[PDB]
Amino acid sequence: GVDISPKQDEGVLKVIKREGTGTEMPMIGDRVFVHYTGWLLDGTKFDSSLDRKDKFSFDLGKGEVIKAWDIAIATMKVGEVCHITCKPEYAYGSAGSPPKIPPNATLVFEVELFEFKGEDLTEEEDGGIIRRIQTRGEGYAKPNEGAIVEVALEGYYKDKLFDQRELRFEIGEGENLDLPYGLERAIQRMEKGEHSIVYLKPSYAFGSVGKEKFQIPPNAELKYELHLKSFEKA
Numbered sequence: 001g002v003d004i005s006p007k008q009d010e011g012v013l014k015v016i017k018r019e020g021t022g023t024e025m026p027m028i029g030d031r032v033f034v035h036y037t038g039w040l041l042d043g044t045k046f047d048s049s050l051d052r053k054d055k056f057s058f059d060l061g062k063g064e065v066i067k068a069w070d071i072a073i074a075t076m077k078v079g080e081v082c083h084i085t086c087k088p089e090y091a092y093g094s095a096g097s098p099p100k101i102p103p104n105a106t107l108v109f110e111v112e113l114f115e116f117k118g119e120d121l122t123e124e125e126d127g128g129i130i131r132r133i134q135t136r137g138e139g140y141a142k143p144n145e146g147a148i149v150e151v152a153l154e155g156y157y158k159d160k161l162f163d164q165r166e167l168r169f170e171i172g173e174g175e176n177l178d179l180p181y182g183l184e185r186a187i188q189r190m191e192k193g194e195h196s197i198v199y200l201k202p203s204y205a206f207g208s209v210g211k212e213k214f215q216i217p218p219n220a221e222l223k224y225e226l227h228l229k230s231f232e233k234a
């Protein structure tokens with residue numbers, strides 16, 4: 001296997017069993033759909049999603065799964081099947097996960113990637129605001145209502161640029177700066193230094209009114225490229 005651990009300490013070793021398609025791989029924040037089987041190093045099977053009705057899904061790069069999985073799934077293409085050998089430091093460590101996983105266990109997973117998609121940032125989960133993180137930010141802190149943010153933004157309608165600015169403004173006051181509501185909600189989910197693409201459905205953008213000065217008609221879907229440069233909370 002190929003050592004895919006950031007520290008190159010052979011913590012996560014990947015063997016590709018079947019190559020996937022295209023070039024794209026899941027990004028941090030993306031929802032990911034896989035089937036897997038897990039064995040201890042001695043070949044004892046402890047679990048498989050194949051034994052259940054649904055694919056296993058999780059959000060990548062958020063510490064929702066063991067570190068070996070956040071590392072490994074990021075390297076996969078759609079359709080890929082790989083085997084990953086995971087040292088305990090990248091899995092369950094000294095604690096283990098009784099009764100299935102003993103302390104200090106090296107784990108082997110077979111993983112097949114079926115699908116991934118951008119993160120739906122909406123409260124209703126109606127697909128109205130979809131994010132694709134390009135580059136992860138620094139701290140985990142995010143701007144809240146009333147935070148003063150510095151943001152570089154590019155707005156596109158049908159891939160044509162209509163707005164490109166570097167702004168400093170208070171979250172909650174974006175409307176007066178011709179920023180759509182959904183963009184301000186998206187910024188509240190971003191970390192300092194993060195570069196993301198955010199897709200807005202009309203309901204979260206300029207709705208039935210549009211934005212005439214930006215040549216945006218009623219009921220327009222928009223795409224923004226956003227860089228959160230800095231912010232001061234509160």
Ligand SMILES: CCC(C)(C)C(=O)C(=O)N1CCCC[C@H]1C(=O)O[C@H](CCc1ccc(OC)c(OC)c1)c1cccc(OCC(=O)O)c1
Binds near residue numbers: 091
């Ligand atoms: C050991 C048996 C289980 C948990 C079923 C297993 O097969 C397993 O080992 N996994 C399930 C498939 C993804 C990889 C792996 C896993 O991460 O499961 C994690 C275990 C919990 C965990 C999360 C994050 C951690 O660090 C940031 C962490 O550190 C010890 C523990 C998990 C994630 C989501 C759901 C879940 O259980 C529900 C289910 O069985 O579907 C288990």
